[PDB]
Design a binder for these strands. Structure first.
Ligand code: VO4
Ligand code: VO4
Ligand code: VO4
Ligand code: VO4
Ligand code: VO4
Ligand code: VO4
Ligand SMILES: [Mg+2]
Ligand SMILES: [Mg+2]
Length: 136
RNA sequence: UCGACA
DNA sequence: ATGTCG
């Protein structure tokens, strides 16, 4: 299987886990940053990966784009497929912002239709995903 | 008992 | 190290 360059790549970035979470989506071909989330004080890697895909889904749908989305997160891909984020992050006053975004993301998935293929970025064959933050 | 993706 | 799934 080859890389579908005509696509959107998303990825999470964090400082600690759980810790500060952010994410962005980029054009897989050029690397142009199409959107980037404002750092979230506290959240998990998988929540961020999940929010990144849903944000890409809405980004593409508003523009009537049928391009697929690449993510390197097996967990986030499954959560999106089930339209349910199974995070273990403790629900409390500290993790309110991330959980709210996560709940709203889920809500969006349960209130909208889309055919966007959500593809697994084969990191071991193609190297780091184009929207990556972390060290290689 | 791990294996895997982050 | 910690977050999650097969
Ligand atoms: O802009 V919306 O996709 O929330 O309908
Ligand atoms: O722009 V939203 O109706 O996907
Ligand atoms: O972005 V919503 O149409
Ligand atoms: O209307 V936003 O798709
Ligand atoms: O723009 V639609 O919500
Ligand atoms: O505006 V979104 O349907
Ligand atoms: Mg990732
Ligand atoms: Mg990354």
């Amino acid at each position: 299987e080859e890389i579908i360059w005509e696509s959107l790549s998303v990825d999470v970035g964090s400082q600690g886990n759980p810790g500060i979470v952010e994410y962005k989506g980029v054009d897989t071909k050029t690397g142009e940053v199409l959107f980037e989330r404002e750092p979230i004080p506290i959240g998990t890697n998988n929540m961020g990966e999940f929010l990144a895909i849903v944000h890409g889904l809405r980004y593409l749908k508003e523009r009537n784009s049928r391009k697929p989305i690449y993510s390197d997160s097996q967990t986030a891909i499954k959560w999106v497929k089930d339209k349910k984020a199974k995070s273990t992050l403790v629900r409390n006053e500290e993790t309110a912002l991330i959980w709210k975004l996560v709940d709203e993301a889920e809500e969006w998935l349960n209130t909208h239709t889309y055919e966007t293929p959500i593809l697994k970025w084969q990191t071991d064959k193609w190297g780091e995903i184009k929207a990556n933050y972390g060290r290689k």
